[PDB]
Amino acid sequence: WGRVLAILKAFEEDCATPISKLRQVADAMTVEMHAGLASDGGSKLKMLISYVDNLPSGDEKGLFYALDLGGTNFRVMRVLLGGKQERVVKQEFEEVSIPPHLMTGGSDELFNFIAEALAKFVATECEDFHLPEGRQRELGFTFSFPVKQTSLSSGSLIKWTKGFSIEEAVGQDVVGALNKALERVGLDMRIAALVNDTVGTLAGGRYYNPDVVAAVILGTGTNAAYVERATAIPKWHGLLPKSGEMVINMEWGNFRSSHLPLTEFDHTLDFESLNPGEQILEKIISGMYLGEILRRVLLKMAEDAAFFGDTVPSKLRIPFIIRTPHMSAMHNDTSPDLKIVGSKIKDILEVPTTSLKMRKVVISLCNIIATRGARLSAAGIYGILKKLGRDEVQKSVIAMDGGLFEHYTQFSECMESSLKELLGDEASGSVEVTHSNDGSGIGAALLAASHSLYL
Ligand SMILES: OC[C@H]1O[C@@H](O)[C@H](O)[C@@H](O)[C@@H]1O
């Protein structure tokens, strides 16, 4: 077990995020926020204008549809809004796993999948959700990819991230593409808003809590949005919003700094990915990648340190075979025999069985990987708070969403703890991390509700 332990120790050390490194990252993040707001091409942080200069207040009422395209899942929903006291009276939704072939196929095919699913959902309208005869359906479109926004309800795709690669779609208007698809299925919908999922989550949180100033997604991918002062955005002067505010989609997944604790496994993951050199921060934080970092460490232990015996298990060679929900399960195991770790490894990798020593290393690996991702997330949030100048009783709330933060308890608890550590005793009480909802989707509908053409 000597060589295995040597790899583990080295990995542990290389992944280290002491409080000093987190401060360095937060500062680097804040610098890049200024640079990305200064000019369109001056930073790894795109800092995209959302054209959302006003967030939902809670008094919104009516019937609204929302559409949410993520990296792995697609969601359609409709809500009935009843104002300040009733809020969300009723909500109906469906979720569909995106067929992997659609992620790298053609543009029309993807939008057809979206429109066809929506048309089936609309067909189930009844009772409370029946469309009033003299009205049309109003829709908020959550699109979880970088978009060059041209208005509240228009913008073109900058690039794909996560598992997606449809080169045909790059530079095309996303709303226009959806509109064509809706027309292909004969569906009539007014698209009231196009928002990134971070922006949707921000609107969802603000709807319930006036103190919400930013939103963070920790799911398949990672990103953050926040409310910036319009005057503090030198690169942009389209609208002159009465609010003096403008929500920014940071696209922080693309953040890179020399301060990032990268390892050889991160480098090989990146070098062999769909988008080499891009989304560097996301590749060490988000759910798509955490399990893949684990697989690559285990693969090296298997190849060079006989971790699984004399032969490398074939399933260990399949990229993304180990997923973050597996990690969550294993990490959570406190049994003396580590029976959950043993069961999961055996199911995924198809190995005969695992000794306790093997299970200890795996869970140690899970903790190292999750802890690095969680602590860097906290540094990013701290970076946002610095930008807002909030590092009295000017309470700041961060709305959270995503499968990592929602289901991976060790991860979420570590992130919050690290953030409060960065804030320190004095400033700790001024910042709060909140909830989740299905905010990405619901938020887009609430934004549509703010811009409804009906009374
Ligand atoms: O879903 C969270 C994030 O995933 C990233 O890969 C995308 O580039 C962002 O647009 C999105 O906000």
Curated annotation (Swiss-Prot):
Q: Which InterPro entries match?
A: ATPase_NBD (IPR043129), Hexokinase (IPR001312), Hexokinase_BS (IPR019807), Hexokinase_C (IPR022673), Hexokinase_N (IPR022672)
The domain of life for this entry's organism is Eukaryota
Q: Where is this region: Hexokinase large subdomain?
A: 196-438
Positions that bind D-glucose: T161, K162, N196, D197, N223, E251, E282
Membrane topology listed for this record: Single-pass membrane protein
Q: Where does ADP bind?
A: G71, T72, N73, T220, G403
Reaction catalysed by this enzyme: a D-hexose + ATP = a D-hexose 6-phosphate + ADP + H(+); D-fructose + ATP = D-fructose 6-phosphate + ADP + H(+); D-glucose + ATP = D-glucose 6-phosphate + ADP + H(+)
Indicate yes or no for the key word Transmembrane helix: yes
Regarding tissue, the record states: Highly expressed in flowers and siliques, at intermediate levels in roots and stems, and at lower levels in rosette and cauline leaves.
Subunit comment: Interacts with RPT5B in nucleus. Interacts with RHIP1. Interacts with KING1 in mitochondria. Interacts with CLF (via SANT domain) and EZA1/SWN (via SANT domain) in nucleus.
Summary of the function given for this chain in its UniProt record: Fructose and glucose phosphorylating enzyme. May be involved in the phosphorylation of glucose during the export from mitochondrion to cytosol. Acts as a sugar sensor which may regulate sugar-dependent gene repression or activation. Mediates the effects of sugar on plant growth and development independently of its catalytic activity or the sugar metabolism. May regulate the execution of program cell death in plant cells. Promotes roots and leaves growth.
What family does the entry list?
Belongs to the hexokinase family.
Q: What name does UniProt use for this protein?
A: Hexokinase-1
Print the organism lineage. Answer: Eukaryota, Viridiplantae, Streptophyta, Embryophyta, Tracheophyta
Q: Which gene encodes it?
A: HXK1
